[PDB]
Design an enzyme around this catalytic site. Structure first.
Site, PDB file in Angstrom:
ATOM      1  CD  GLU A  29      -3.335  -0.870   1.859  1.00 29.74           C
ATOM      2  OE1 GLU A  29      -4.060  -1.869   2.041  1.00 29.74           O
ATOM      3  OE2 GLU A  29      -3.521   0.194   2.464  1.00 29.74           O
TER       4      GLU A  29
ATOM      5  CG  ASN B  22     -16.906   2.827   5.838  1.00 24.54           C
ATOM      6  OD1 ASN B  22     -15.745   3.225   5.923  1.00 24.54           O
ATOM      7  ND2 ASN B  22     -17.236   1.741   5.160  1.00 24.54           N
TER       8      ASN B  22
ATOM      9  CD  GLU C 258     -17.703  33.074   0.525  1.00 24.06           C
ATOM     10  OE1 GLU C 258     -18.664  33.303  -0.245  1.00 24.06           O
ATOM     11  OE2 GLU C 258     -17.669  33.449   1.717  1.00 24.06           O
TER      12      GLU C 258
HETATM   13  C1  LIG Z   1      -5.610 -16.776   0.871  1.00 23.31           C
HETATM   14  O1  LIG Z   1      -4.791 -16.686   2.034  1.00 23.31           O
HETATM   15  C2  LIG Z   1      -4.480 -15.486   2.654  1.00 23.31           C
HETATM   16  C3  LIG Z   1      -3.842 -14.470   1.930  1.00 23.31           C
HETATM   17  C4  LIG Z   1      -3.503 -13.227   2.470  1.00 23.31           C
HETATM   18  C5  LIG Z   1      -2.804 -12.235   1.592  1.00 23.31           C
HETATM   19  C6  LIG Z   1      -1.801 -11.382   2.286  1.00 23.31           C
HETATM   20  C7  LIG Z   1      -0.679 -12.026   2.818  1.00 23.31           C
HETATM   21  C8  LIG Z   1       0.267 -11.253   3.453  1.00 23.31           C
HETATM   22  C9  LIG Z   1       0.131  -9.814   3.568  1.00 23.31           C
HETATM   23  C10 LIG Z   1      -0.965  -9.143   3.049  1.00 23.31           C
HETATM   24  C11 LIG Z   1      -1.946  -9.892   2.398  1.00 23.31           C
HETATM   25  C12 LIG Z   1      -3.097  -9.122   1.852  1.00 23.31           C
HETATM   26  S1  LIG Z   1      -3.991  -8.318   3.165  1.00 23.31           S
HETATM   27  C13 LIG Z   1      -4.919  -6.926   2.644  1.00 23.31           C
HETATM   28  N1  LIG Z   1      -5.852  -6.358   3.426  1.00 23.31           N
HETATM   29  N2  LIG Z   1      -6.337  -5.306   2.631  1.00 23.31           N
HETATM   30  C14 LIG Z   1      -5.665  -5.319   1.451  1.00 23.31           C
HETATM   31  N3  LIG Z   1      -4.767  -6.338   1.450  1.00 23.31           N
HETATM   32  C15 LIG Z   1      -4.019  -9.946   0.932  1.00 23.31           C
HETATM   33  C16 LIG Z   1      -5.513  -9.827   1.255  1.00 23.31           C
HETATM   34  O2  LIG Z   1      -6.081 -11.034   0.750  1.00 23.31           O
HETATM   35  C17 LIG Z   1      -5.051 -11.986   0.422  1.00 23.31           C
HETATM   36  O3  LIG Z   1      -5.291 -13.100  -0.010  1.00 23.31           O
HETATM   37  C18 LIG Z   1      -3.686 -11.422   0.635  1.00 23.31           C
HETATM   38  O4  LIG Z   1       1.222  -9.335   4.234  1.00 23.31           O
HETATM   39  C19 LIG Z   1       2.119 -10.427   4.508  1.00 23.31           C
HETATM   40  O5  LIG Z   1       1.432 -11.608   4.050  1.00 23.31           O
HETATM   41  C20 LIG Z   1      -3.786 -12.976   3.805  1.00 23.31           C
HETATM   42  C21 LIG Z   1      -4.413 -13.947   4.600  1.00 23.31           C
HETATM   43  O6  LIG Z   1      -4.699 -13.677   5.912  1.00 23.31           O
HETATM   44  C22 LIG Z   1      -4.145 -12.540   6.562  1.00 23.31           C
HETATM   45  C23 LIG Z   1      -4.842 -15.277   4.086  1.00 23.31           C
HETATM   46  O7  LIG Z   1      -4.378 -16.323   4.947  1.00 23.31           O
HETATM   47  C24 LIG Z   1      -4.883 -17.589   4.522  1.00 23.31           C
HETATM   48  N1  LIG Z   2     -12.260   3.498   6.082  1.00 17.38           N
HETATM   49  C1  LIG Z   2     -12.354   2.463   5.270  1.00 17.38           C
HETATM   50  N2  LIG Z   2     -11.231   1.894   4.674  1.00 17.38           N
HETATM   51  C2  LIG Z   2     -11.374   0.819   3.840  1.00 17.38           C
HETATM   52  C3  LIG Z   2     -12.631   0.277   3.592  1.00 17.38           C
HETATM   53  N3  LIG Z   2     -12.467  -0.763   2.737  1.00 17.38           N
HETATM   54  C4  LIG Z   2     -11.144  -0.899   2.443  1.00 17.38           C
HETATM   55  N4  LIG Z   2     -10.452   0.069   3.139  1.00 17.38           N
HETATM   56  C5  LIG Z   2      -9.011   0.348   3.101  1.00 17.38           C
HETATM   57  O1  LIG Z   2      -8.635   0.562   1.743  1.00 17.38           O
HETATM   58  C6  LIG Z   2      -7.345   0.006   1.513  1.00 17.38           C
HETATM   59  C7  LIG Z   2      -7.476  -1.159   0.545  1.00 17.38           C
HETATM   60  O2  LIG Z   2      -8.146  -0.707  -0.613  1.00 17.38           O
HETATM   61  P1  LIG Z   2      -9.602  -1.180  -1.104  1.00 17.38           P
HETATM   62  O3  LIG Z   2     -10.572  -0.066  -1.371  1.00 17.38           O
HETATM   63  O4  LIG Z   2     -10.188  -2.272  -0.264  1.00 17.38           O
HETATM   64  O5  LIG Z   2      -9.101  -1.873  -2.477  1.00 17.38           O
HETATM   65  P2  LIG Z   2      -9.704  -1.685  -3.900  1.00 17.38           P
HETATM   66  O6  LIG Z   2      -9.909  -0.271  -4.256  1.00 17.38           O
HETATM   67  O7  LIG Z   2     -10.984  -2.385  -4.006  1.00 17.38           O
HETATM   68  O8  LIG Z   2      -8.548  -2.309  -4.801  1.00 17.38           O
HETATM   69  P3  LIG Z   2      -8.378  -3.861  -5.215  1.00 17.38           P
HETATM   70  O9  LIG Z   2      -9.255  -4.792  -4.403  1.00 17.38           O
HETATM   71  O10 LIG Z   2      -6.936  -4.229  -5.067  1.00 17.38           O
HETATM   72  O11 LIG Z   2      -8.852  -3.956  -6.643  1.00 17.38           O
HETATM   73  C8  LIG Z   2      -6.850  -0.492   2.857  1.00 17.38           C
HETATM   74  O12 LIG Z   2      -6.187   0.586   3.510  1.00 17.38           O
HETATM   75  C9  LIG Z   2      -8.136  -0.792   3.590  1.00 17.38           C
HETATM   76  O13 LIG Z   2      -7.993  -0.673   4.976  1.00 17.38           O
HETATM   77  C10 LIG Z   2     -13.750   0.852   4.184  1.00 17.38           C
HETATM   78  O14 LIG Z   2     -14.877   0.413   3.973  1.00 17.38           O
HETATM   79  N5  LIG Z   2     -13.603   1.949   5.013  1.00 17.38           N
END
Ligand SMILES: COc1cc([C@@H]2c3cc4c(cc3[C@H](Sc3nnc[nH]3)[C@@H]3COC(=O)[C@H]23)OCO4)cc(OC)c1OC
Ligand SMILES: Nc1nc2c(ncn2[C@@H]2O[C@H](COP(=O)(O)OP(=O)(O)OP(=O)(O)O)[C@@H](O)[C@H]2O)c(=O)[nH]1
Ligand SMILES: Nc1nc2c(ncn2[C@@H]2O[C@H](COP(=O)(O)OP(=O)(O)O)[C@@H](O)[C@H]2O)c(=O)[nH]1
Ligand SMILES: [Ca+2]
Ligand SMILES: [Mg+2]
Ligand SMILES: [Mg+2]
Ligand SMILES: [Mg+2]
Ligand code: NA
Lengths: 36, 440, 418
Positions: free
Chosen positions: B183, B228, B254
């Site tokens: 991110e 939200n 403004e």
């Molecule tokens: C399918 O298995 C998993 C995968 C991840 C993994 C995943 C794995 C990661 C990671 C991040 C993230 C991201 S987390 C995210 N939340 N909002 C946007 N992105 C993403 C999200 O979805 C994901 O699939 C990614 O950092 C170190 O290892 C995470 C998991 O649990 C924490 C799951 O454990 C089984």
């Molecule tokens: N405040 C707030 N943050 C959110 C929400 N949903 C996701 N986030 C934050 O947004 C970031 C992740 O982006 P998302 O909007 O979920 O991702 P996206 O725009 O759908 O992009 P992709 O799924 O990768 O296609 C992370 O910082 C999350 O914590 C929400 O409903 N409210």
């Protein structure tokens, strides 16, 4: 346009590596014909 | 006349959009089917709420809004949710494959497949406007769609609508609320790309909102719904001048004159009060002085930073509810003798005040208490660059090793775009330093 | 509607493949006849990730069963859930591989592969939007290892932009079938480094030690080992199957450099949230015979399942990082992600599954490399492989690649922020 060319070139390179693996798998089976 | 079109991009933007439009309907007396019994002009009108709602001949009041996401499952919940009847199906746009947390896929690989459709739907909304004022764009910094598709959309909006104003509500990432490791990359890339295309951007730090929910509402682990709803109250405060009118009302445009001294310095710091539980609001009336005071407490900021350690270039107070200027002026007089409010030497030190009389509402069954008066302060402080510093530091840690960079190169990007984006952030940070330095 | 296509190859691949399907079928409320008899709409909300919907409201695993021998696959059709698989999705040869990677990769496996790809294509084309593929297989055998990596490469030519995910069982003398296993494993690792996006290392030496030491099983069978595999596989697929995750998001967040994509999985228990977190990070609970205290974590994903305080999960996950910060690379900020799913696995009130990208995985590859180098230094058993057309430079190539992998994990283990 730059992004389109870059990504296409990455896929092309990837497939070219995979097709070199196909050539090597034929040279391996041909190399087996030549010891029988 | 003076219509605003809202655009909600990716999961964050869409879910915040759900919260905002639900709140608007409650504030305006619009039912979930879109009927508004108080509105006696069927099918049209020039009322203040028509800046945000169009009208059908069948009496339905329709958000001037587009919801866009590259996966369907978040918008599907809108399509099937409580307010499904608010929206025409064409206003809710989904692809089939999201951007996988990758700016490159949101801006290029996946985003380029749907951008023309999105722009065609926006054009359909714009054509219904007699005097379009601009766009409000809601999105995360961190998601692949929120970062990458939003930048693409903003670039295209500048081409298609010229310098028509575009405001952002941008969700700044916090580890507490879920977050991909990449991110910081997505944030810098989208900030760099959108910078010249945005006129004003309200950053919302998910950690700030998380803390406010835990501390003020006594919620142990806030959900997205918790965050939200609070965010929608800030959005509602900021857009209230567009949607209501009254003698003391001051239009957001403004305030924007005062808040943006240079094109790039366009990131106001928002603070909101009061946020209080039903249990604590019962038998406690927060006065004008009380809520005003709360704006100057850092715990109530939308972004974590320390304004005591920067300088002000503007301070705006947006009041709603039971508030008269006499009480405002007194409260401000008190504040100015008890707080660290240092302005740059090239700008006046007055506070700009607006008052919207319509009182605040809350979603029934939520956690926010209904209060009789609230305030949102918008200041332009050099301290907000602390938020950029924090994000630039995480970027630098990863980028020096090129960690995860191959996922972006694989999608066609070049490292050149990374360093150019990072250099733009460095110049932004230096811009904030320079404007705070005293004049020769 | 983000479909995954599952492929199981060889004896090991098909046996753990079949257990995997029994286990997640039970979790989603699917019986051996393919009909849904569950009690929660959360079981069906993402069922389409792994199952096809058919006539009669039946659900069919999107699975392809592959072997060069009919043995194991006939057992699968006979066992529980045997008739839930689509019969056209069985693809079996007759000759077998003989625990010879070259046979699975170049000769016997090569003229079965095209008929496997016909089933892959059929399954892929009915997909609304394919995420990618997951292959179960062992690396010590000949079919799963040799023909499995062949399948991976051939699938990559037709689906170059889809995720390739494997569950790869690493060989151990403590469970050893043959003597040439370090050859088959090293040749297979060679392909995996290049052609998969993510690989769960299921290490038979870890599974043995877990069964013997922790579970107190003097003579561990393959049934006891596979019980660990199935619980792990259920754990790491949880977030794909219930309503935060998909294969690409997983690879984006776990794989900072394309070659460093070999994960150490972990499971607890083998009961409070602190206790559960502690055990999930303990070397004893790793499904790979590597001590994470001998390396550093690049990335970590943890799934907690069961009804528990998410505030307590957050506090304990932050706790284990702050108290062990030296073990998490500083140049990937916020590199531990935590998910919670309400639905516990069968038989537990709560459980924790761990996916780690640790530089300590090198201990696995170093163990295989020494077993390889001990035979290759004396050219032992090479005729099995040159006899199919291979030359020694391909062994020399495969082992250099795997040693480079080790060096690369070491390079990032030693790298600092300033
Ligand atoms: C399918 O298995 C998993 C995968 C991840 C993994 C995943 C794995 C990661 C990671 C991040 C993230 C991201 S987390 C995210 N939340 N909002 C946007 N992105 C993403 C999200 O979805 C994901 O699939 C990614 O950092 C170190 O290892 C995470 C998991 O649990 C924490 C799951 O454990 C089984
Ligand atoms: N405040 C707030 N943050 C959110 C929400 N949903 C996701 N986030 C934050 O947004 C970031 C992740 O982006 P998302 O909007 O979920 O991702 P996206 O725009 O759908 O992009 P992709 O799924 O990768 O296609 C992370 O910082 C999350 O914590 C929400 O409903 N409210
Ligand atoms: N964990 C586990 N390992 C297995 C199983 N079956 C075989 N193995 C291991 O797999 C390797 C042999 O490969 P195998 O699948 O039997 O040969 P293939 O049929 O040609 O692919 C050896 O290291 C065995 O210990 C199983 O059911 N579970
Ligand atoms: Ca009270
Ligand atoms: Mg998304
Ligand atoms: Mg065998
Ligand atoms: Mg999971
Ligand atoms: Na009207």
């Amino acid at each position: 346009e730059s992004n389109k060319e870059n990504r296409e070139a990455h896929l092309a390179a990837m497939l070219e590596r995979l097709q070199e693996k196909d050539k090597h798998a034929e040279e391996v089976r041909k190399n087996k014909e030549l010891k029988e | 006349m003076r219509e605003c079109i809202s655009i909600h991009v990716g999961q964050a933007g869409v879910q915040i959009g759900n919260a905002c439009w639900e709140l608007y309907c409650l504030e305006h007396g619009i039912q979930p089917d879109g009927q508004m019994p108080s509105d006696k002009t069927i099918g049209g009108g020039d009322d203040s709420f028509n800046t945000f709602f169009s009208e059908t001949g069948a009496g339905k009041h329709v958000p001037r809004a587009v919801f866009v996401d590259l996966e369907p499952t978040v918008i599907d919940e809108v399509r099937t949710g409580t307010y499904r009847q608010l929206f025409h199906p064409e206003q809710l746009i989904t692809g089939k494959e999201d951007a996988a947390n990758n700016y490159a896929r949101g801006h290029y690989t996946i985003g380029k497949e749907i951008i023309d459709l999105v722009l065609d739907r926006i054009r359909k909304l714009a054509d219904q406007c007699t005097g379009l004022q601009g766009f409000l764009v809601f999105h995360s910094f961190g998601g692949g769609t929120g970062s990458g598709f939003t930048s693409l959309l903003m670039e295209r909006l500048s081409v298609d609508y010229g310098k028509k104003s575009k405001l952002e509500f941008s969700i700044y990432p916090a580890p507490q609320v879920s977050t991909a490791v990449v991110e910081p990359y997505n944030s810098i890339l989208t900030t760099h790309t959108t910078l010249e295309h945005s006129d004003c951007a309200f950053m919302v730090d998910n950690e700030a909102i998380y803390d406010i929910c835990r501390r003020n509402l006594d919620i142990e682990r806030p959900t997205y719904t918790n965050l939200n709803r609070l965010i929608s109250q800030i959005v509602s405060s900021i857009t209230a001048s567009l949607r209501f009118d009254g003698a003391l009302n001051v239009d957001l445009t403004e305030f924007q004159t005062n808040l943006v001294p240079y094109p790039r310095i366009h990131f106001p710091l928002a603070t909101y009060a009061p946020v209080i539980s039903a249990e604590k609001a019962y038998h406690e009336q927060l006065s004008v002085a009380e809520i005003t005071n709360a704006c100057f407490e850092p715990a109530n900021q939308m972004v974590k930073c320390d304004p005591r350690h920067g300088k002000y270039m503007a301070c705006c107070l947006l009041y709603r509810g039971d508030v008269v200027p006499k009480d405002v002026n007194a409260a401000i007089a008190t504040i100015k003798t008890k707080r660290s409010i240092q302005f740059v030497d090239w700008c006046p030190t007055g506070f700009k005040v607006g008052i919207n009389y319509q009182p605040p509402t809350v979603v029934p069954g939520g956690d926010l208490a209904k209060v009789q008066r609230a305030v949102c302060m918008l200041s332009n402080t050099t301290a907000i660059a602390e938020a950029w510093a924090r994000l630039d530091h995480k970027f630098d840690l990863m980028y020096a090793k090129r960690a995860f960079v191959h996922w972006y190169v694989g999608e066609g990007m070049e490292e050149g775009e990374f360093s150019e984006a990072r250099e733009d952030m460095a110049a932004l940070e230096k811009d904030y330093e320079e404007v705070g330095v005293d004049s020769v | 509607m983000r479909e995954i296509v599952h492929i199981q190859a060889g004896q090991c691949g098909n046996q753990i493949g079949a257990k995997f399907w029994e286990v997640i079928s039970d979790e989603h409320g699917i019986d051996p006849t393919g009909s849904y008899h569950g009690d929660s709409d959360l079981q069906l909300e993402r069922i389409n990730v792994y199952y096809n919907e058919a006539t009669g409201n039946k659900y069919v695993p999107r699975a392809i069963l592959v072997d060069l021998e009919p043995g194991t696959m006939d057992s699968v059709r006979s066992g529980p859930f045997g008739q839930i698989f689509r019969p056209d999705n069985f693809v079996f040869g007759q000759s077998g591989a003989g625990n010879n990677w070259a046979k699975g990769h170049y000769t016997e496996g090569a003229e079965l592969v095209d008929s496997v790809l016909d089933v892959v294509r059929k399954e892929s084309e009915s997909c609304d939007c394919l995420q990618g593929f997951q292959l179960t297989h062992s690396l010590g055998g000949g079919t799963g290892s040799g023909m499995g990596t062949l399948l991976i490469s051939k699938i990559r030519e037709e689906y170059p932009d889809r995720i390739m995910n494997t569950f790869s069982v690493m060989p151990s003398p403590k469970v050893s079938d043959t003597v040439v296993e370090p050859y088959n494993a090293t040749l297979s690792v060679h392909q995996l480094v290049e052609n998969t996006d993510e690989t769960y290392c299921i290490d038979n030496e870890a599974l043995y030690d877990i069964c013997f030491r922790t579970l107190k099983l003097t003579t561990p069978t393959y049934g006891d080992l596979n019980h660990l595999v199935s619980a792990t596989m259920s754990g790491v697929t949880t977030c794909l199957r219930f309503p935060l995750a998909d294969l690409r998001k997983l690879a984006v967040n776990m794989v900072p450099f394309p070659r460093l994509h070999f994960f150490m999985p972990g499971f607890a228990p083998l009961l409070t949230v602190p206790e559960l977190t502690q055990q999930m990070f303990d070397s004893k609970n790793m499904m790979a015979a590597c001590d994470p205290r001998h390396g550093r974590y690049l990335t970590v994903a943890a799934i907690f399942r069961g009804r528990m305080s998410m505030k307590e999960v957050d506090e304990q996950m932050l706790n284990v990082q702050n108290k062990n910060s030296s073990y998490f690379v500083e140049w990937i900020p916020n590199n531990v992600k935590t998910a919670v799913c309400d639905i516990p696995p069968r038989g537990l009130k709560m459980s924790a599954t761990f996916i780690g990208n640790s530089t300590a995985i090198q201990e696995l590859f170093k163990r295989i490399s020494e077993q390889f180098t001990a035979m290759f230094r004396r050219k032992a058993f090479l005729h099995w492989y040159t006899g199919e057309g291979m030359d020694e430079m391909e062994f020399t190539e495969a082992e250099s690649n795997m040693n480079d992998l080790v060096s690369e994990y070491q390079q990032y283990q030693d790298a600092t922020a300033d």
